[PDB]
Every structure is written in C-alpha cells, then in structure tokens.
Amino acid sequence: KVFGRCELAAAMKRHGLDNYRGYSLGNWVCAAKFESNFNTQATNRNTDGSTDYGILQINSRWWCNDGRTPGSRNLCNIPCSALLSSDITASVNCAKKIVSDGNGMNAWVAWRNRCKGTDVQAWIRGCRL
C-alpha cells in the first residue's frame, strides 16, 4: 500500500506513535517519507547482507527475522515479511522498540540526515488528526 501523507499521519496516531518517546507525528511521517516514500512493500538490501523492510525500513540485522541475515537478532520477535503489511501495526510496534533502544530516531539514518531539526510539522500540515 502507498499511503497518503495525512492517511499515514492518521494511521500512526491510531497506533499511538504521535509523541511516542517525545517524537511528534511530523517526525514519524517525515521518517516514513524518506525511508519508504510511504510504500508498505519497500525492501532495500544493505551492503552487509541485511535487508530493510516496510514504511520505516526496519533492518533484519537486529529487529526482524528474514532467515538470510547471518549473525543477526530478531528483537521485535516477528518475520520481516510482517513489516510489509498494508496494516502498519507490526511496523509501529517494532519502531516503538527501536526508538526506545537509546539513540531515539537517530536509528533511522534518513531521519537524522533529512528530518532532524527541519520543520517536521509541515508533514502533518492541513491533516484532520
């Protein structure tokens, strides 16, 4: 599924991501924009042989099991394929653990480089929330 900006903002709120660990809904929408361009089916192979899955590009290296990431953990206790669902529950649940892991949203390198410090409220501007 390819979410609209306000559609994703609404689904993230419905799943309690808005101000989770102090990160406004705009931070999460901005992260999804640059990680997946709002596409729940986005997959990207890392040079290290791990894969990033879904709207928030959760990495098989630590967070999900894809069966082909040697030495890797599955700390969200889910198959990486479950992070490709049109329903974002699994991605939201796992992102809540990632953003609690101690470096906040710096875990998303696209967030650090393209959202951090920017006017992130622009991402939820005009959204009925």
Q: How far apart are CA 66 and CA 81, in angstroms?
A: 7
- Is residue 51 close enough to count as binding Na ion by CB under 5 A? no
Q: How far apart are CA 71 and CA 75, in angstroms?
A: 13
Tell me if 80 sits within 8 A of 53, measured CB to CB: yes
Distance set, CA 78 to CA 31, 37, 63, 64 (Å): 21, 23, 8, 5
Near Na ion by CB under 5 A: residue from 24, 39, 41, 74? 74
- Is residue 69 close enough to count as binding Na ion by CB under 5 A? yes
Total of chain residues touching Na ion, rule CB under 5 A: 5
| Residues designated as active site | 35, 52
Q: Is 48 part of any known ligand binding site?
A: no
Near Na ion by CB under 5 A: residue from 36, 57, 60, 91? 60
- Is residue 72 close enough to count as binding Na ion by CB under 5 A? yes
Q: How far apart are CA 103 and CA 32, in angstroms?
A: 18
Stretches 5-13, 51-59, 64-72, 89-97: which one binds Na ion (CB under 5 A)?
64-72
Binding site for Na ion (CB under 5 A): 60, 65, 69, 72, 74
